[PDB]
A and B are shown apart, each in its own frame.
With several copies, the nearest count.
Chain A
Amino acid sequence: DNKLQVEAIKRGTVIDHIPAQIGFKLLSLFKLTETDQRITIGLNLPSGEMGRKDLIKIENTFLSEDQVDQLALYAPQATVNRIDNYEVVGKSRPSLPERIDNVLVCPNSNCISHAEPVSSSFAVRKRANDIALKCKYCEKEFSHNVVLAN
């Protein structure tokens, strides 16, 4: 027959219930694949809670509450499982962070952040049912949908 098998991880993180099409986006942003650690990704998996979902497993790697919170912009209904000795030892859900640093680029062409050795930074807030991001430097505010990443 065959030797097909996916060996459960001893220690690390399992990001579950990622909405369809978002899994690859998370990998791209947070540079999750820039590591020598074993990673396992399932995309378009069947789900009871969601119908379709993506799933990211990363060995020997953990996310702080803030790192988990960054995920709220993209996958708010995701579950982040911390794993030690093959056991789910922690389950967290992303709560909207107060700031998003480093990964996004201010869309204002005249912002000082583009010309100088600083890291991007936006304050995060709910506006209607949109998420508004206010650049720490130029203080202009944008819909998160138009604020690109690096």
Chain B
Amino acid sequence: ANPLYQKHIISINDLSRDDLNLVLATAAKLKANPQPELLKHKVIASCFFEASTRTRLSFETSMHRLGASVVGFSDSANTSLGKKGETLADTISVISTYVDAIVMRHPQEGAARLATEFSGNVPVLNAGDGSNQHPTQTLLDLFTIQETQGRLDNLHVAMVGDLKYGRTVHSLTQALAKFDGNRFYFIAPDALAMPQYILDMLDEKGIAWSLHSSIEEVMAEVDILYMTRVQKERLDPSEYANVKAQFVLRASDLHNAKANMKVLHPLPRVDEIATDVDKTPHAWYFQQAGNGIFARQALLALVLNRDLVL
């Protein structure tokens, strides 16, 4: 069996460099030549307990491109958890008697980990749990970085905006830190700084990172400029001073960019990336999104098939 067969996909912390490279190699292949019947006779639950456009629709499209069926919900309001008081525990307990895998997004940290304690032999894929982890976003992010940069090593990567509540950057930093010689630039408001347990992990691996108060400060040397949205649905009321984007990228800020530099953003953006950026060769957030298809197909294929031949 491949290393990821029947495994839960909860946290980048539980995956190795080799695991991540496997998904990336598998995604490259499925992008190259598609396998429309690979998950034939699989039924997969898509259970979203908070809003999503990209993650749910790319996941579901991916399942269909591989020939699987999909059941689930995009809102919990009409499940028995929403109307009859049912626990998440029981919800997973019954759904895991129906389907072959469970994709879940949830507003509480830990929800996906908890699901794995009730799903028995049914694998759980974490589509986002509160402000904790977002492993499939990281898979597509890595794939996009790899595609545009040719490598996952010795990169200069800036992450901008809400790093405290960004489950996207928690997972992405952890993953990039499993590769060699990457350097990180963290550009965030103080109240929303990259959390300490991430910085500690960088330290004990001897990875260089620094804090900056502007994008121009590092524009000339970054290979990847990773922009983020302020997670206003996560902010404590005491943090409402930070609701507006502190850093707004505009086409004119890119004058001294490396030619190969790409602007990424897991999306949705509010105002942190101005629409005039979209036409520039550095804009790559929509191509990034498009890559969610190949990363998520790859993940589903490796988890639900013992061996792949491609």
Q: Is B113 an interface residue (CB 8 A)?
A: yes
With A116-B88, A118-B89 already in contact, the answer to whether A135 and B110 are too (CB < 8 A) is: yes
With A117-B89, A118-B89 already in contact, the answer to whether A137 and B110 are too (CB < 8 A) is: yes
* Contact indicator A139/B109 (Cβ below 8 Å): yes
**Quick one: closest B residue to A137, CB to CB?**
B110
Q: Which of B108, B114, B197 contacts A110 (CB 8 A)?
A: B108
Q: Which of B87, B109, B234, B275 contacts A140 (CB 8 A)?
A: B109
* Contact indicator A116/B89 (Cβ below 8 Å): yes
* Contact indicator A110/B130 (Cβ below 8 Å): yes
B:242-283 near A, CB below 8 Å: 275
With A110-B131, A117-B87 already in contact, the answer to whether A127 and B111 are too (CB < 8 A) is: no
**Bound CA span A125–B171, Å:** 21
**Bound CA span A128–B234, Å:** 30
**Bound CA span A140–B131, Å:** 10
Total A-B residue contacts, Cβ distance less than 8 Å: 67
Interchain nearest-CB distance for A100 vs B (Å): 16
Contacts of B144 in A (CB 8 A): none
**Quick one: closest B residue to A136, CB to CB?**
B113
24 A/B residue pairs, CB under 8 Å, sorted by A: A110-B130, A112-B106, A112-B108, A112-B109, A112-B114, A112-B129, A112-B130, A113-B110, A115-B87, A116-B114, A117-B87, A118-B114, A118-B117, A127-B200, A134-B197, A136-B113, A137-B109, A137-B113, A138-B108, A138-B109, A139-B113, A140-B109, A140-B195, A141-B196
Contacts of B89 in A (CB 8 A): 116-118
Contacts of B11 in A (CB 8 A): 139
**Quick one: closest A residue to B92, CB to CB?**
A116
Contacts of A138 in B (CB 8 A): 108-110, 129-130, 132
**Bound CA span A127–B199, Å:** 12
With A113-B110, A116-B114, A134-B197 already in contact, the answer to whether A139 and B13 are too (CB < 8 A) is: yes
A:108-150 near B, CB below 8 Å: 108, 110-113, 115-118, 127, 132, 134-141
Q: Is B107 an interface residue (CB 8 A)?
A: yes
* Contact indicator B108/A115 (Cβ below 8 Å): yes
Q: Is B119 an interface residue (CB 8 A)?
A: no
- Interface residue ranges, B against A (CB under 8 Å): 11, 13, 87-89, 106-111, 113-114, 117, 129-133, 195-197, 200, 234, 275
A:21-61 near B, CB below 8 Å: none
Contacts of B131 in A (CB 8 A): 110
Contacts of B108 in A (CB 8 A): 110-112, 115, 138
* Contact indicator A117/B110 (Cβ below 8 Å): no
**Quick one: closest A residue to B196, CB to CB?**
A141
**Bound CA span A108–B109, Å:** 9
**Bound CA span A121–B146, Å:** 36
* Contact indicator A116/B87 (Cβ below 8 Å): yes
With A118-B117, A139-B109 already in contact, the answer to whether A112 and B88 are too (CB < 8 A) is: yes
Contacts of A127 in B (CB 8 A): 200
**Bound CA span A110–B114, Å:** 14
**Quick one: closest A residue to B131, CB to CB?**
A110
Contacts of B133 in A (CB 8 A): 139
Contacts of B275 in A (CB 8 A): 117
Interchain nearest-CB distance for B265 vs A (Å): 15
Interchain nearest-CB distance for A115 vs B (Å): 7
**Bound CA span A109–B109, Å:** 9
* Contact indicator A111/B110 (Cβ below 8 Å): yes
**Quick one: closest B residue to A106, CB to CB?**
B110
**Bound CA span A140–B130, Å:** 12
**Bound CA span A112–B88, Å:** 9
